[PDB]
Write a protein that binds this ligand. Structure first.
Ligand SMILES: [Cl-]
Ligand SMILES: [Cl-]
Ligand SMILES: [Cl-]
Ligand SMILES: [Cl-]
Ligand SMILES: [Cl-]
Ligand code: NA
Ligand code: NA
Lengths: 156, 134, 134, 159
């Protein structure tokens, strides 16, 4: 009975303001990610590795507000957060307020596996990750036109 | 926000969440997403949960752990615990959103009280289900 | 870490916690103290809790909310919920610490599994009690 | 109904062998004074929320306790402070983490609770929000005490 569920965010999604082709881009992205998780589960991969990979793919996909495609703050910056929890060991890892880590869920897993801590924040979280070989990315690699236009509209 | 929950062939549960927060957010605000028990929780005894929606309300309501505790201590089904948290408790605090959950028996729930939630799920070896709207 | 819980004449519960963390801590670590449900929780339906001790275990076990949920959903008394969390569940995960708690009926509990906990309590109009050791 | 306060100043390895009665009495006297202030406030009809805020503010101000003044030192000889407060009536909460320039973190947490739509803020963002609401900027040096610096030194090597 192995199973995966994913989400890409809850909120005001308006169908009047949507075309079917626009919707299908989201459906296709979700379907591809769930299929990757299903195949990993069928292959005997761990639940922890499956949720990590699914969230890494949602981060990579610019359609979803995580990683690449992150929304903008009041200051036109990105501040990213992630968590991961293993139901077997009850171990967890989390980062908040990081701007220089491409894949926050991977940094969260690094906190869980390579420290005794659950949660790290900001530059201290980044420095923990960098000291362990995780790459420092330009803070601007997350930026997209669509999310910048939504920022402009939020202000108005 | 994005998230995933899974039950593997060895009966293990896990959960993950990742986000950029909210458009136009005040720098330094932390929502429930990186908070164990608020945005994300997993326990093989009960459930794996990942949340999305009004950040402050999911923290105040400890929404992800509340699903677990309603099942474990309250004896609620996954569906009843999800209905209680998402359709009753979150709106009572002024909150909007949803979550995804899988229990240790492989029941799945994708409740939300918003106009939409980008979501998908599927059992291993089966065709996935996708959705956006209600 | 320090903390306070109170029940007022109007029947309201509140909790607060403050800390410097651990000597020699790695900069950027957040323990369970600022986190609703881990280090601090209050709900007039159940309990007010402030925690102190092994940071990572109080988060993983959501200790403060777990007291509340054991009482509200499980029907445990304050004393029973405190014993369950502090003397059974937290040690099972390798956690050391304690907490202070007042329930909506005015019962007070100051459980700890450590050698000591600096603590004090008192009813309005009564003499205070203080302690360090067991 | 019967109003009541409890406080704590931390759980851990205290041994009698390590302590003098005068050392113990400093802790007892501080705890007694703070709980007595809380009791008096409750008796006078002050809210539980105001009572736990004031008690924790006093525990912060007290150098004996690891919060506010008397905070432990990090690996980098810095102070990083955190606090939370929660109201059981409204289920509102406020919290700050990783703050170094706010004298009383619990007051900053109460400011997040009462003067924002948020529950938690961290680091410089939290400080900037507090300063925008008129809270005073302090140097993190104000938290430093000889006792806690000596504990950092005893836990490490010099170089
Ligand atoms: Cl909506
Ligand atoms: Cl399916
Ligand atoms: Cl749909
Ligand atoms: Cl001990
Ligand atoms: Cl004693
Ligand atoms: Na993305
Ligand atoms: Na202090």
């Amino acid at each position: 009975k192995a199973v995966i569920a994913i989400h890409g965010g809850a909120g005001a999604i308006s169908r009047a303001q949507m075309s079917l082709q626009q919707e299908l881009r989201y459906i296709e992205a979700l379907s591809a990610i769930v299929e990757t998780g299903q195949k990993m589960l069928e292959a005997g991969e761990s639940a922890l590795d499956v949720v990590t990979e699914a969230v890494r793919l949602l981060e990579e996909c610019p359609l979803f507000n995580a990683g690449i495609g992150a929304v903008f703050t009041r200051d036109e910056t990105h501040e990213l957060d992630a968590c991961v929890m293993d139901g077997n060991t009850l171990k967890a890892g989390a980062v908040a307020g990081v701007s220089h880590l491409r894949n926050p869920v991977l940094a969260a897993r690094l906190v869980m596996e390579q420290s005794p801590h659950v949660m790290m924040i900001g530059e201290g979280a980044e420095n923990f990750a960098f000291a362990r070989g995780m790459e420092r990315v330009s803070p601007e690699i997350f930026s997209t036109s669509l999310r910048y236009e939504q920022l402009l509209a939020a202000r108005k | 926000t994005v998230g995933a929950v899974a039950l593997d062939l060895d009966g293990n549960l896990a959960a993950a969440t990742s986000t950029g927060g909210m458009t136009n957010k005040l720098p330094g605000v932390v929502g429930p997403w990186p908070l164990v028990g608020a945005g994300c929780y997993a326990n093989n005894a009960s459930v794996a949960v990942s949340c999305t929606g009004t950040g402050e309300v999911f923290i105040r309501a400890l929404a992800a752990y509340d699903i677990a505790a309603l099942m474990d201590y309250g004896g609620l089904s996954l569906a009843e615990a999800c209905e209680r948290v998402v359709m009753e408790k979150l709106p009572a605090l002024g909150g909007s959103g949803g979550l995804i959950a899988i229990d240790h028996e492989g029941n799945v729930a994708l409740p939300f009280n918003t106009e939409g939630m980008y979501r998908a799920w599927g059992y291993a070896g089966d065709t996935p289900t996708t959705g956006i709207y209600r």
